[PDB]
Coordinates of C-alpha atoms and ligand atoms in Angstrom, one line a residue:
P1 CA 0.4 28.7 -4.4
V2 CA -2.7 27.7 -2.4
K3 CA -3.5 24.7 -4.6
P4 CA -1.7 22.7 -7.3
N5 CA -3.0 22.3 -10.9
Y6 CA -2.1 18.8 -11.8
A7 CA -3.4 17.8 -15.3
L8 CA -3.1 14.6 -17.2
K9 CA -0.3 14.6 -19.7
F10 CA 0.4 10.9 -20.5
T11 CA -1.3 7.5 -20.1
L12 CA 1.2 4.7 -20.1
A13 CA -0.4 1.4 -21.3
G14 CA 1.4 -1.9 -21.7
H15 CA 0.9 -4.1 -18.6
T16 CA -1.7 -6.8 -19.2
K17 CA -2.7 -7.2 -15.5
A18 CA -3.0 -4.9 -12.4
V19 CA -0.1 -2.5 -11.9
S20 CA 1.2 -2.7 -8.3
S21 CA 3.8 0.0 -8.0
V22 CA 5.4 3.0 -9.8
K23 CA 8.6 4.7 -8.7
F24 CA 10.6 7.5 -10.2
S25 CA 14.4 7.0 -10.5
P26 CA 16.4 9.3 -8.1
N27 CA 18.0 11.0 -11.2
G28 CA 14.5 11.9 -12.5
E29 CA 14.9 10.3 -15.9
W30 CA 12.8 7.1 -15.5
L31 CA 9.7 5.6 -14.1
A32 CA 9.7 1.9 -13.1
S33 CA 6.4 0.0 -12.8
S34 CA 5.6 -3.5 -11.5
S35 CA 2.6 -5.7 -12.2
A36 CA 0.6 -8.8 -11.6
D37 CA 1.7 -9.7 -15.2
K38 CA 5.1 -10.7 -13.6
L39 CA 6.8 -7.8 -15.5
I40 CA 8.7 -4.7 -14.7
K41 CA 8.5 -1.8 -17.2
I42 CA 10.6 1.2 -17.6
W43 CA 9.2 4.5 -19.0
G44 CA 10.5 8.0 -19.7
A45 CA 9.6 10.2 -16.7
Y46 CA 9.0 13.4 -18.7
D47 CA 7.5 12.0 -22.0
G48 CA 5.9 8.7 -20.8
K49 CA 7.7 6.9 -23.6
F50 CA 8.0 3.1 -23.1
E51 CA 11.6 2.2 -22.7
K52 CA 11.9 -1.6 -21.9
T53 CA 10.5 -4.6 -20.2
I54 CA 12.4 -6.5 -17.5
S55 CA 11.4 -10.2 -17.0
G56 CA 12.2 -13.1 -14.7
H57 CA 9.8 -13.4 -11.7
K58 CA 7.7 -16.5 -11.8
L59 CA 4.6 -14.8 -10.3
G60 CA 3.2 -11.3 -9.9
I61 CA 5.2 -8.4 -8.5
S62 CA 4.1 -6.3 -5.6
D63 CA 6.8 -3.6 -5.5
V64 CA 9.8 -2.2 -7.1
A65 CA 12.5 0.3 -5.8
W66 CA 15.5 2.1 -7.2
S67 CA 19.1 2.3 -6.0
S68 CA 20.4 5.8 -5.1
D69 CA 22.5 6.0 -8.3
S70 CA 19.5 5.0 -10.5
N71 CA 21.4 2.0 -11.9
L72 CA 19.7 -0.9 -10.0
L73 CA 16.1 -1.9 -9.3
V74 CA 14.9 -4.4 -6.6
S75 CA 11.5 -6.1 -7.1
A76 CA 9.3 -8.0 -4.6
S77 CA 7.2 -10.9 -5.8
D78 CA 4.5 -13.4 -5.0
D79 CA 7.2 -16.0 -6.0
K80 CA 8.7 -15.4 -2.4
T81 CA 11.8 -13.8 -3.8
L82 CA 13.2 -10.4 -4.5
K83 CA 15.4 -9.8 -7.5
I84 CA 18.1 -7.2 -8.0
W85 CA 18.3 -5.9 -11.6
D86 CA 20.9 -4.0 -13.6
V87 CA 18.4 -1.7 -15.4
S88 CA 20.6 -0.8 -18.4
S89 CA 21.4 -4.4 -19.3
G90 CA 18.2 -6.0 -18.0
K91 CA 20.3 -8.6 -16.1
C92 CA 19.1 -10.2 -12.9
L93 CA 22.2 -9.8 -10.7
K94 CA 20.8 -11.6 -7.6
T95 CA 17.7 -13.5 -6.5
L96 CA 17.1 -12.9 -2.8
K97 CA 15.8 -16.1 -1.2
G98 CA 14.6 -16.5 2.4
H99 CA 11.0 -15.3 2.8
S100 CA 8.6 -18.2 3.2
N101 CA 5.7 -16.5 1.5
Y102 CA 4.7 -13.5 -0.8
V103 CA 7.1 -10.6 -0.6
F104 CA 5.1 -7.4 -0.7
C105 CA 7.4 -4.4 -0.2
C106 CA 11.1 -3.4 -0.7
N107 CA 13.5 -0.5 -0.6
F108 CA 17.2 0.2 -0.9
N109 CA 18.9 2.2 1.9
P110 CA 20.4 5.6 0.8
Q111 CA 23.9 4.1 0.5
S112 CA 22.3 1.3 -1.5
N113 CA 24.5 -1.5 0.0
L114 CA 21.4 -2.8 1.7
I115 CA 17.8 -3.8 0.8
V116 CA 14.9 -4.1 3.2
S117 CA 11.9 -6.3 2.5
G118 CA 8.5 -7.1 4.1
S119 CA 6.5 -10.2 3.5
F120 CA 3.2 -12.0 4.1
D121 CA 5.4 -14.3 6.3
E122 CA 5.3 -11.4 8.9
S123 CA 9.1 -10.8 8.9
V124 CA 11.2 -7.9 7.8
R125 CA 14.5 -9.0 6.1
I126 CA 17.7 -6.9 5.6
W127 CA 19.8 -8.1 2.6
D128 CA 23.3 -7.4 1.3
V129 CA 23.1 -6.1 -2.2
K130 CA 26.6 -7.2 -3.3
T131 CA 26.3 -10.9 -2.2
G132 CA 22.5 -11.3 -2.1
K133 CA 22.7 -12.8 1.4
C134 CA 20.1 -12.2 4.1
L135 CA 21.9 -10.4 6.9
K136 CA 19.0 -10.2 9.4
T137 CA 15.5 -11.6 9.8
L138 CA 13.4 -9.4 12.1
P139 CA 10.4 -11.1 13.8
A140 CA 8.7 -7.8 13.1
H141 CA 5.0 -8.4 13.2
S142 CA 2.2 -10.8 13.9
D143 CA 0.5 -10.3 10.5
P144 CA 1.6 -9.5 6.9
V145 CA 4.0 -6.6 6.5
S146 CA 2.7 -4.0 4.1
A147 CA 5.6 -1.5 3.8
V148 CA 9.2 -1.0 4.7
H149 CA 11.4 2.1 4.4
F150 CA 14.8 3.4 5.4
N151 CA 15.2 6.9 6.9
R152 CA 17.5 9.6 5.4
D153 CA 20.8 8.2 6.7
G154 CA 19.8 4.5 6.6
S155 CA 20.2 4.0 10.4
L156 CA 16.5 3.3 10.9
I157 CA 13.8 1.2 9.2
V158 CA 10.1 1.8 9.6
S159 CA 7.7 -1.2 9.0
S160 CA 3.9 -1.4 8.9
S161 CA 1.6 -4.4 9.2
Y162 CA -2.0 -5.7 9.2
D163 CA -1.4 -6.3 13.0
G164 CA -2.1 -2.5 13.4
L165 CA 1.4 -1.5 14.3
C166 CA 4.1 0.7 12.9
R167 CA 7.6 -0.3 14.2
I168 CA 10.9 1.5 14.0
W169 CA 14.1 -0.7 13.8
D170 CA 17.8 0.0 14.3
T171 CA 19.4 -1.1 11.0
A172 CA 22.7 -2.1 12.6
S173 CA 21.4 -4.2 15.5
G174 CA 17.9 -5.2 14.2
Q175 CA 16.5 -4.1 17.6
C176 CA 12.9 -2.7 17.7
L177 CA 13.3 0.9 19.0
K178 CA 9.6 1.9 18.8
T179 CA 6.1 0.6 18.4
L180 CA 3.6 3.3 17.4
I181 CA -0.1 2.9 18.4
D182 CA -2.8 5.6 18.5
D183 CA -6.4 5.2 19.9
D184 CA -7.1 1.9 17.9
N185 CA -5.1 -0.6 15.8
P186 CA -6.7 -0.9 12.3
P187 CA -4.5 -2.6 9.7
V188 CA -1.6 -0.3 8.7
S189 CA -1.4 -0.5 4.9
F190 CA 1.5 1.9 4.3
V191 CA 4.3 3.7 6.0
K192 CA 7.2 5.9 5.1
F193 CA 9.6 8.5 6.7
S194 CA 9.3 12.1 5.7
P195 CA 12.3 13.4 3.5
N196 CA 13.9 15.0 6.6
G197 CA 13.3 11.8 8.6
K198 CA 11.6 13.5 11.6
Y199 CA 8.1 12.2 10.8
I200 CA 6.3 9.1 9.4
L201 CA 3.3 9.1 7.2
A202 CA 1.1 6.0 7.8
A203 CA -2.1 4.8 6.1
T204 CA -4.7 2.7 7.8
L205 CA -7.6 0.7 6.3
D206 CA -10.1 3.0 8.0
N207 CA -9.8 5.6 5.2
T208 CA -7.2 7.6 7.1
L209 CA -3.7 8.8 6.6
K210 CA -1.8 10.1 9.6
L211 CA 1.5 12.1 10.1
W212 CA 3.4 11.0 13.2
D213 CA 6.1 12.5 15.2
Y214 CA 7.6 9.0 15.9
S215 CA 10.3 10.3 18.3
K216 CA 7.7 11.9 20.6
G217 CA 5.3 9.1 19.4
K218 CA 2.4 11.4 18.7
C219 CA 0.0 11.9 15.8
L220 CA 0.3 15.5 14.3
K221 CA -1.9 15.5 11.3
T222 CA -4.8 13.4 10.0
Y223 CA -5.9 13.3 6.3
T224 CA -9.3 12.0 5.2
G225 CA -12.0 12.2 2.4
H226 CA -10.6 9.3 0.3
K227 CA -11.6 5.7 0.2
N228 CA -9.1 3.1 1.6
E229 CA -10.5 0.0 3.4
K230 CA -9.1 -3.0 1.4
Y231 CA -6.0 -2.2 -0.6
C232 CA -2.5 -1.3 0.5
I233 CA -2.2 2.0 -1.2
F234 CA 1.0 3.9 -1.4
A235 CA 1.2 7.6 -0.3
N236 CA 3.8 10.4 -0.7
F237 CA 5.2 13.7 0.4
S238 CA 5.2 16.1 -2.5
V239 CA 8.0 18.7 -1.9
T240 CA 9.0 20.1 -5.4
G241 CA 6.4 22.9 -5.2
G242 CA 3.7 23.3 -2.6
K243 CA 3.9 20.9 0.3
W244 CA 1.3 18.2 -0.3
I245 CA 0.4 14.7 0.7
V246 CA -0.5 12.5 -2.2
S247 CA -2.4 9.2 -2.2
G248 CA -4.4 6.8 -4.4
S249 CA -7.9 5.8 -3.5
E250 CA -10.5 3.0 -4.0
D251 CA -12.9 5.5 -5.7
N252 CA -10.3 5.6 -8.6
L253 CA -9.0 9.1 -7.8
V254 CA -5.7 10.5 -6.8
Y255 CA -6.1 12.7 -3.7
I256 CA -3.8 15.7 -2.9
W257 CA -4.0 17.4 0.5
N258 CA -2.3 20.5 1.9
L259 CA 0.1 18.9 4.4
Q260 CA -0.4 21.7 7.0
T261 CA -4.1 22.5 6.8
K262 CA -5.1 18.9 5.9
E263 CA -7.6 20.2 3.3
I264 CA -8.1 18.3 0.0
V265 CA -6.6 20.7 -2.7
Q266 CA -7.1 18.4 -5.7
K267 CA -8.7 15.1 -6.8
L268 CA -7.3 13.7 -10.1
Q269 CA -9.9 11.9 -12.3
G270 CA -9.0 9.5 -15.1
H271 CA -8.3 6.0 -13.8
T272 CA -11.1 3.4 -14.0
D273 CA -10.0 1.2 -11.1
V274 CA -8.4 1.5 -7.6
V275 CA -5.4 3.7 -7.7
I276 CA -3.0 1.6 -5.7
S277 CA 0.2 3.5 -6.2
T278 CA 1.4 7.1 -6.6
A279 CA 4.9 8.5 -6.9
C280 CA 6.2 12.1 -6.9
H281 CA 9.1 13.1 -9.2
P282 CA 12.3 14.2 -7.3
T283 CA 12.7 17.7 -9.0
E284 CA 9.6 18.5 -11.1
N285 CA 6.0 18.8 -10.1
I286 CA 5.0 15.5 -11.7
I287 CA 2.9 12.7 -10.2
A288 CA 2.7 9.1 -11.5
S289 CA -0.3 7.0 -10.6
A290 CA -1.1 3.3 -11.3
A291 CA -4.4 1.3 -11.2
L292 CA -5.6 -2.2 -10.6
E293 CA -6.9 -5.0 -13.0
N294 CA -9.9 -3.2 -14.6
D295 CA -7.7 -0.2 -15.6
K296 CA -4.1 -1.5 -16.1
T297 CA -2.7 1.9 -17.0
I298 CA -0.2 4.3 -15.4
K299 CA -0.8 8.1 -15.7
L300 CA 1.6 11.1 -15.5
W301 CA 0.2 14.3 -14.3
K302 CA 2.0 17.7 -14.3
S303 CA 1.4 21.0 -12.3
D304 CA 2.9 24.5 -12.6
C305 CA 3.3 24.6 -8.8
Ligands
IA9_1 C1 -0.8 -6.1 -8.5 C2 -0.3 -6.7 -7.3 C3 0.4 -7.9 -7.3 F1 0.7 -8.5 -8.5 C4 0.8 -8.6 -6.2 C5 0.5 -8.1 -4.9 C6 -0.2 -6.9 -4.8 C7 -0.5 -6.5 -3.5 O1 -1.7 -6.3 -3.1 N1 0.5 -6.3 -2.6 C8 0.4 -6.0 -1.3 C9 -0.3 -7.0 -0.5 C10 -0.4 -6.7 0.9 N2 -1.1 -7.6 1.7 O2 -2.1 -8.4 1.2 O3 -0.8 -7.7 3.1 C11 0.1 -5.6 1.5 C12 0.8 -4.6 0.6 C13 0.9 -4.9 -0.7 N3 1.6 -3.9 -1.4 C14 0.8 -3.3 -2.5 C15 1.8 -2.7 -3.5 N4 2.6 -1.6 -2.9 C16 3.5 -1.0 -3.8 C17 3.6 -2.4 -2.1 C18 2.8 -3.2 -1.0 C19 -0.7 -6.2 -6.0 CL1 -1.5 -4.8 -5.8

């Protein structure tokens, strides 16, 4: 339809400090969350039912990501490591050591034989999942790296940084293939490829989201009306029903825009602190949102379209 009708269905409480990231498993069954409380929690994606806690990091966790088969998780921590987890057993399979400071972001490639990470140390690292060895260290940026993401076939990596740049990397060679810069270079707080891999969605700490044609190297859409000047807030493409852009905001709301018209179609009220993370379910019209220290809860919202 014209607008979605997301309504609050479940509030997931359990973390005792700020929640940093929420991610749906590719198979749609689970939600994983990470927190400053050093814990990963697993929850039912459709019922919000608490499943289990996964522990081991020595400091707070900034991000979590699923393998393509929904069996593994990778986490990125202030303790300067990433950990690879077998979700079913809760086992830490590997600890990925190499970054010299806080690890902020992580992702598996589609094949899930590789992990990419970004750190406060200004590097992007590519890791082998099976051995846990660092395969490449990319001298990616001149300030902390806020996000890293593989494209649809894993041949490219996009990275964003407080240095105001988005960079595109060849996975195989580690070569920088593109540096994206618009009219200014405010800190880039988030970036990801579109599902089809033709565009990149990037957030900057000037209350702006932008859709880029990275190949042409041109900004196609701009999304505004939300508050984002301090925190690295995750954004998403919603594609299960109407085509939306979804993001958290520092006014405690989840914002939803029409991708094409750039109009705000919904604002979701409920959280009591900054909404730092949102996720969109892979097959159903379900959004997960998570908030910082004064809230500590995760919310599941559902729409008919
Ligand atoms: C709750 C919590 C932690 F326990 C640890 C780190 C963070 C955090 O702010 N991570 C972060 C830091 C920077 N930075 O200072 O350059 C940039 C990006 C992130 N994040 C926020 C969480 N997003 C899922 C991943 C990237 C957060 Cl929110």
